[PDB]
Amino acid sequence: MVLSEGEWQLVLHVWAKVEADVAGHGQDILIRLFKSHPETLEKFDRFKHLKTEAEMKASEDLKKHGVTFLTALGAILKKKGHHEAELKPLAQSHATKHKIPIKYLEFISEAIIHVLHSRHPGNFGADAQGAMNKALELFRKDIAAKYKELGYQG
Numbered sequence: 001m002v003l004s005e006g007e008w009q010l011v012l013h014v015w016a017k018v019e020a021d022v023a024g025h026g027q028d029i030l031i032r033l034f035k036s037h038p039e040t041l042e043k044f045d046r047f048k049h050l051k052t053e054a055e056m057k058a059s060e061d062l063k064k065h066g067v068t069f070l071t072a073l074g075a076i077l078k079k080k081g082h083h084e085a086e087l088k089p090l091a092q093s094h095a096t097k098h099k100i101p102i103k104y105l106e107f108i109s110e111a112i113i114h115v116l117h118s119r120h121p122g123n124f125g126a127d128a129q130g131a132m133n134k135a136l137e138l139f140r141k142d143i144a145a146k147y148k149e150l151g152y153q154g
């Protein structure tokens with residue numbers, strides 16, 4: 001699939017706001033993911049033991065990982081579709097080291113869209129949400145094809 005330049009502008013316009021508080025957004029997103037789909041928390045051997053949302057908020061480690069994850073996703077969205085290099089090392093680790101099924105990438109996509117809707121309603125109307133959703137669908141599609149080349153799932 002190919003986004004238009006007007007669709008990438010809606011995605012990078014709301015991302016510019018996210019980047020004013022990277023740690024905050026990375027933390028909200030992971031917590032939302034772990035609350036909504038608790039099974040995903042099991043894939044993190046470093047966080048697995050956190051029992052409540054209050055424990056998750058207080059975790060400095062979780063907050064450091066939210067920064068790492070969001071910064072890597074930002075770098076991919078700023079490429080505007082030309083992200084092949086950035087996707088290779090990410091596909092290799094998530095398929096072979098971490099073993100993250102595509103279904104979980106769909107769950108985190110849902111958590112990203114929930115948090116931006118919540119924190120940025122004026123910049124995340126229907127058209128902006130449709131463009132972000134396309135950008136994450138493009139990312140999931142490319143990653144799924146790389147997973148299949150690497151021998152995982154498909």
Ligand code: HEM
Binds near residue numbers: 043068093
């Ligand atoms: C937009 C999607 C995602 C991005 C951009 C992202 C990026 C990252 C990055 C940059 C790292 C550190 C380097 C590496 O190991 O590759 C990482 C680590 C990891 N990721 Fe992801 N990731 C994504 C989705 C997920 C999903 C949905 C899960 C689990 C449900 C997941 C589980 C992990 C785990 C288990 C690690 C290791 C954490 C630790 O022990 O250090 N990732 N991820």
